[PDB]
Design a protein around this ligand. Sequence first.
Ligand SMILES: Nc1ncnc2c1ncn2[C@@H]1O[C@H](COP(=O)(O)OP(=O)(O)NP(=O)(O)O)[C@@H](O)[C@H]1O
Ligand SMILES: Nc1ncnc2c1ncn2[C@@H]1O[C@H](COP(=O)(O)OP(=O)(O)NP(=O)(O)O)[C@@H](O)[C@H]1O
Ligand SMILES: [Mn+2]
Ligand SMILES: [Mn+2]
Ligand SMILES: [Zn+2]
Lengths: 173, 304, 285, 154, 1009
Amino acid sequence: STQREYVFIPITNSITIDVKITIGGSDHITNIDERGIHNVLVITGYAVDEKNGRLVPTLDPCDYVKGILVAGTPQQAQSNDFLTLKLPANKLYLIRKKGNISDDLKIYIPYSSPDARNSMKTKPVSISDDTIVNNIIKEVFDKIYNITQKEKVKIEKVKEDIKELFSYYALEQ
Amino acid sequence: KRVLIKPLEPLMFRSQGEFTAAQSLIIPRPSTIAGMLGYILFNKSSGTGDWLSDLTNLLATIYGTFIETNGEYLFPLRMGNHLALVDQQHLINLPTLLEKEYERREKGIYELFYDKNKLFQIINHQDRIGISIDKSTRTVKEHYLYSARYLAFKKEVNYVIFIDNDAISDKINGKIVNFGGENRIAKLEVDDYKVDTSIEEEYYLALSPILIPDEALDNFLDNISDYVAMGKVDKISLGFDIANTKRKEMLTAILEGSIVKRSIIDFIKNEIKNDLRYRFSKYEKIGYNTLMSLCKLALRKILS
Amino acid sequence: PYYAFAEPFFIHAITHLHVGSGSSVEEEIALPFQRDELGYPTIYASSLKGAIKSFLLKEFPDKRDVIYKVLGEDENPEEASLGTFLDAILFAIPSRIIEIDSAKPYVWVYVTTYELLKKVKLYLDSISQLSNASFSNLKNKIDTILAKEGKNITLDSDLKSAILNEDFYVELEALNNKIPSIINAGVPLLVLEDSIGREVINRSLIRVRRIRIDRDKKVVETGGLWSEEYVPMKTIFFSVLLGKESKESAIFASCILRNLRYVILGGKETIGKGIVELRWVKDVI
Amino acid sequence: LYEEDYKLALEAFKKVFNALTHYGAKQAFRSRARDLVEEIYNSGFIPTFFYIISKAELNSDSLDSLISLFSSDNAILRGSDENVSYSAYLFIILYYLIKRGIIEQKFLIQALRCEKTRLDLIDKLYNLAPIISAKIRTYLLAIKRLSEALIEAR
Amino acid sequence: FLDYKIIALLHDPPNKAWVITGRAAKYIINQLFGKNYSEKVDNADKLASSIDRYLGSIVYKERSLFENRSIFLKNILLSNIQRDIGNLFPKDKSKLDNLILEYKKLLNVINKTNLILKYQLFYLIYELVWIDSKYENTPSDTRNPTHTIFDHLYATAAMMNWILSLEKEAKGYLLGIDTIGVADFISKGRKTRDLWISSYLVSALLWYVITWFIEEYGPDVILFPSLRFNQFYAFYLLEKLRKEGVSEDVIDEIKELITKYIFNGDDLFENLKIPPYPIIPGRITLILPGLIREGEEYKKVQDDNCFISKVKERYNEGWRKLIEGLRCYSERKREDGFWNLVCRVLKLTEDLLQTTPLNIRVKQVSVTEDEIFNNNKLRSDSWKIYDNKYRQLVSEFKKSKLVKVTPESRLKLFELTKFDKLPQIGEKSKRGYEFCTSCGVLPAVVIMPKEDELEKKLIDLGIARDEKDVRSIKNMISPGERLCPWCLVKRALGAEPRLMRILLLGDLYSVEKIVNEIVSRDVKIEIPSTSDIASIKTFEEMIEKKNEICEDLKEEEVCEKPSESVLSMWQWFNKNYYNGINLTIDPEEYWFSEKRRRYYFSVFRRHRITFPSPYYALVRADSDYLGDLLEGKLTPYLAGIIDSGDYANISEKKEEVNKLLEEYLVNAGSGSIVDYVKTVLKCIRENLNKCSCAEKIYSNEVAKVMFRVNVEKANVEEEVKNSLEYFETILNEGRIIVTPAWHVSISSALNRGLLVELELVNKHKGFVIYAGGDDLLAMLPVDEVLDFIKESRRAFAGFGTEKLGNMCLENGFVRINNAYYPSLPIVGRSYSVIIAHYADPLFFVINDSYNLLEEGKEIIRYRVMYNGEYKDAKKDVAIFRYQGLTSVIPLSLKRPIVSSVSDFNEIASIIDVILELKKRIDEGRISVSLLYDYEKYKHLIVASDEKYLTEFLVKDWIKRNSLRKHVEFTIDEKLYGVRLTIENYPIKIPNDLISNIVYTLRIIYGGEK
Ligand SMILES: Nc1ncnc2c1ncn2[C@@H]1O[C@H](COP(=O)(O)OP(=O)(O)NP(=O)(O)O)[C@@H](O)[C@H]1O
Ligand SMILES: Nc1ncnc2c1ncn2[C@@H]1O[C@H](COP(=O)(O)OP(=O)(O)NP(=O)(O)O)[C@@H](O)[C@H]1O
Ligand SMILES: [Mn+2]
Ligand SMILES: [Mn+2]
Ligand SMILES: [Zn+2]
């Protein structure tokens, strides 16, 4: 059948080597149609590890980070430190639900061990530096979606929706 | 710090005209709480035709109202013509449930407003009819038959507010006050309580009516989905001023118990010139624009 | 504070009482008594205020100014009342008792529940810190009683068992201590579990049918049939009078309420309903 | 509250209504149901109970039929419609006392078998008379209404 | 380009059944070019209805492979109702062009420069002229009759808008409209005048915004409600030709053709100049083409703001037009009283009335060539987008519905109430401002005193300037009343209900032309009150006992004469007004007074006539699960067992859902197809799985392709697979895949049921405050509710013995004199009845009429028969309520509602028992003490868990208080164990049916003293 995997957008450039996938299938969970992002995933209870970016599972309901699922599996360098599960296609809190789900979907997750030796108090942070995502599209959003520079005539449109939508939490440690 | 208003008896918070009986609100408006507190702190020398100026001078920033039943905290939640009291443990997954799928949406929300609804376990609506008698005939004086639907409490209930200033929180302790409408009574008690402030989440709960400056009314309304996920928007009067014996004002407001999206904050922050900025800062000072996070008990004002 | 002092008092029904409410066909009784919120009989604060105001205006036609400005002037409404009554809470209703192999054979007892005592303790707590209204012993008794909630409790420790209102068998136990009697009546007080207590109390109310008869032929007039509920003699309600600091309140509380023992409450006074004795809890206990 | 008593009365009436095989015995029991509750609440429970047992012809065969009713539901009461109707009403009262924990079922079944303990049953019932009369009125009136509704007027 | 569907609409005539397989293109048209089919009409057809993939796409356009020689027509909702065509036919070819000469009596007299006017001219009469030619409604398909042919024609032409929108390059739209607070708007009232005009406002405001659509995109653009039987579209076409230019002896072939099939009663639309009944719902959805004209030419645009803003601005423009017309008419009657004041207030508070008291939600989903065309023709799953887009629309609507904005929040009332700069006529309020007694929410602008003198105190306040307008205002505005701007605008529209024509004709006349048309004629319209209804049978009595009891009242103007022409929308008023008792008097002064009461009653004592009871019966009816009925969910079938939430994991009710559509699919076909599909069903647990059973039933297909060969390819390779996976779609994700034809069929049924519902309610003494068919809000007298409900609930399905207006009443069908039309038999329908005093504030009455039904369709559960076991059905409850009582009567006691022709007689049977008992109560056979005695018998009958024992108990309770010791009133036994569950709501509803019957009779007899 099909499967997917998770990518995140921190205030860090820790997404360079994550997976070996560009398309995987032929159609995608998250879409690119001229009014910003679509089918964007929000996962609560996972906070980021900015340097060598990971996400630690906390015990917080409002500690939330957003991410994107595209068909593939990371690097064949995992299955010891990540997680992965196959949900019945509707266990996903994803903003701007547009396409009909496939009644099933397998998705991996970049996981971090709790590191139960530190007094971790997180902090939520907002995305800044319009340049940062204006070239994270150079990093992944064109690597994962070749559509960049080909369809969307309003680049700053997606720039500003990434400004306004995405904001997440950090371990700050 | 924290103020518990414990009604000694059924209460009456008259709303929406008097014209079977006149209905009572569930949660008293912040103007009522501010007016009771100013009634305590009053001095008959600061009079001015601006009721809210003389009221902001008498006290400090007051944070919105919710329900403490028996240690539990209940909070208002409305879907549109549907008020309910829920414990915050059912507000957690609410934003997830908001843009969740359709049939799951109705399943969850109607399970919340009906079975998880703790309103009727707490609140009874008690119609009271009174008359007036002329002291010589001993028969009902003509035209004096009034009715009102009081708000009776099945179990002991408190209204919870948070006040910033701690000086007044000394001469507020253990005061018996004339809380509400037709001469009903409640006791105030003050206790030190710890509450976070100003968290940057996406979905807040309007603990109090969020006012709208009557300038961005068309702006705020013609695209309503951008600011409130669920709740009610209504024109409300601001009450009745004791000094000049008139109604106060009428403003469109987001009724308490509504779910607001983070965007609303910036919106309100961009549509207020200095004049009405000061006006609505006073309004928030007496307690209108209070937000709480669906995460935990953490409050914040919109402007302040 | 603007409620500087409080006067807790008891309302002893000398005759049967009928403080009416909205007559309607949903309660198998045309003219029901005022129900509180739990189905218990209550007296609304407005009824108390109006009745006592009328009584005082009649009995002291010179203190009329004090009475007007403490309990609210009618012809010049511009000034709030310096006095305020809380709703009268049912404190004890008399019940017929059949003793079962006990020491003192009684024919009637006072019956309470734990809901009613919780409300009485609410009223008492909310006024105890007024620096003159103290009555520590009363709320201490109420708290000793409330600790034992769940069990049908008797205060005078001789019953151990009884049949109430000819219909309800209940087993009673003492309070592990004498708990000096709340009221000075020589009748035991029974604090019952709420579920059975509501039944005993609702059975202690008087439901009467009344008719209108044509004077000439002693036949009943067409349609002249209805029912009313009364609250029996000996019934006790509990209420509080709250007063602000103003000086007419002082003279009111001084010589208007000291000479105030009996009062007419409720309606149907030509049927002799409504004679009430007010016991102030500032001299008794 | 005594609202389960209507269910109790329905099943007890079904028992004694099948046990009385002669229709004249049904009508006799009907008259008993309409007379004995009046008499219980006008003369007292103890006088009326003595009157019932005096008229019941409590011999060991009839008592065994009673116990079988308490258990079987195939049992049958015999013996002179007047006597059998008084014994059916005795069973009505006893069935209530059993199903309401006023009288322990084993002690009762022992009483309806031996002879020394029948006086013990009567003495115990004597000490429980206020409680029984207070508690059984709803049940007995339900029995009266059922007998008026189901057994044809003679 | 569009406006040419006349080629596509009649691509199949109303003689299709007699064509296929002998029975001895077709008649393309006598006045137009030939019909074109490359990708327009048949790509519309194979996506419009449900057959074209059900029975196979090639097997459909074959239309003879499993052919049937007979012509049956099953019900769209109930496959198990067989209806034949008998033997009657449309007259043969030697007389065919007979009726074509009627296709040119109104199409050629009106010059055809206007194509849109030809369509809209022909769109209403294509149905009505053929039911004059007695064509008996040949079904859409012969091999699978599941729609009447017109529900296919209008459907293919309505989604032809999408077809043409996709013709050019890329666009296509679904538009929906939902007014925001109809329930609360309606509640705002005082006089039953406000109620009727406010419901008419909710209807007509919404009608205005689509008069634009029907003139610009022509008719048929509307999906809901279908404009095939509309009391508004007929009136609009009529008064539109009245403008276009008619002669009074040329077009009446349409006027009187409408007069009978719509507006069955004599009180016509052309005698009031307004449709007398507000019938338009508050929710209307549309399908739209991507092209738009700004004059003579179309041009498309991609912005999704294309239609929402136009709808909103037109909706506001309608309110502007109507308030300016009110200003004009009030200026005209500057002296005629109560209109000086309307003019004065419309002059004072002008910028307040700039905003409409009703808001609307408007959502919009679009569609592209992608997922509907592959390269230049269709692709797979193309029948799967219309339901997809419609579910998108419904989900966006119900997502928005989570937020309720009140219209009062639109107004800028801050500076008005912060300072004393609020204009107040009458009592200058001491408290800044007062609230209006008709909304309670807004500040009042007109404040009339209660009374101290009542003649100068309303002049010393300046609400009137002369002594002659004192009566003129005191008649329309009662003492102690305080009106807001909106309340006064409504009461003004009520004093003269013909101004709404401005908002009704829909950008066809000028406001001044119509205000000048109706400013000349003085037609005193009358609208009943609640006091009028609470005296109906009084009036009815005085008509017979004319003057034998009118001797003290001859000079009291109650036995006077009819004045000139006072005619009303209330059909009872319009056949009892001239008999000799003036019906325009208001009983609040005569017998419902407090001074003249001891007099009229004293006159009636010596004349021994019934004293009027101060009680009417507000009757509201709401359908059950209509939304997901239109969205394909099977919940309106299994009301109570399956629910809306059950459609989040619909596989979980596999046993109870697969049991249903199983017999709904195969029982819908006719011919050998009935055996073709009844094997591919349940083909996952067959020992055969999906796409594996593909060529496991192949025989019945291949054994038929070699039966009548005309198509080039007898090789299938795809035809079994697409059909089987089609059914797999509809059952795995179990629904009935909704198509345009489905929507049009159910909407047409809604309209036909609407008009027959009107016929029923005025067959009683009812006064229709609103009737959407699916819903209803009337005001009947208390003594006519039961027979109404029993009739109504049955009529809604189609059941009863009378030719109602001019159409028959079958079992699940309505026949318009020869033509069988489908109905809603499966559709449950709840009711609510409130016995109200005339003096009760109408606000509370309307509000709890709404709340009772809304929350009781949810809370109430009752033991329902289902396959022998007993579930808890939810809806189908007729709730009753007195001042303190309440009662519930189930209406179906079975799930599904109907599956056999006999099952119809079970519909609304409990209330029928209530009728047959109410009859014998007052006929002097059973006492009323039957209702006091019952509390003695109730506990035993409740606790009785056995049939014969309860039989004897109820029989004894009847006998013990019978007046004649022989009455035999056999209460049925199914009424014996049915319980009523009521969870988490503080009402007191008895949990057993007989107690509810007793309480129903108690409530109804309470409002008779
Ligand atoms: N013209 C009309 N006059 C009166 N009532 C109407 C009219 N059209 C529809 N209704 C009823 O008004 C109600 C509308 O349902 P609903 O969807 O709640 O709209 P609402 O009542 O305005 N609230 P909302 O759902 O937010 O739109 C239903 O009871 C309809 O039957
Ligand atoms: N898709 C629709 N098409 C037409 N009218 C609709 C649609 N959905 C809702 N309505 C109407 O809008 C109102 C919706 O309120 P309501 O009647 O509670 O919804 P419902 O679908 O009927 N579910 P129910 O509570 O069983 O009636 C009713 O007046 C319906 O007739
Ligand atoms: Mn609506
Ligand atoms: Mn509905
Ligand atoms: Zn108004």
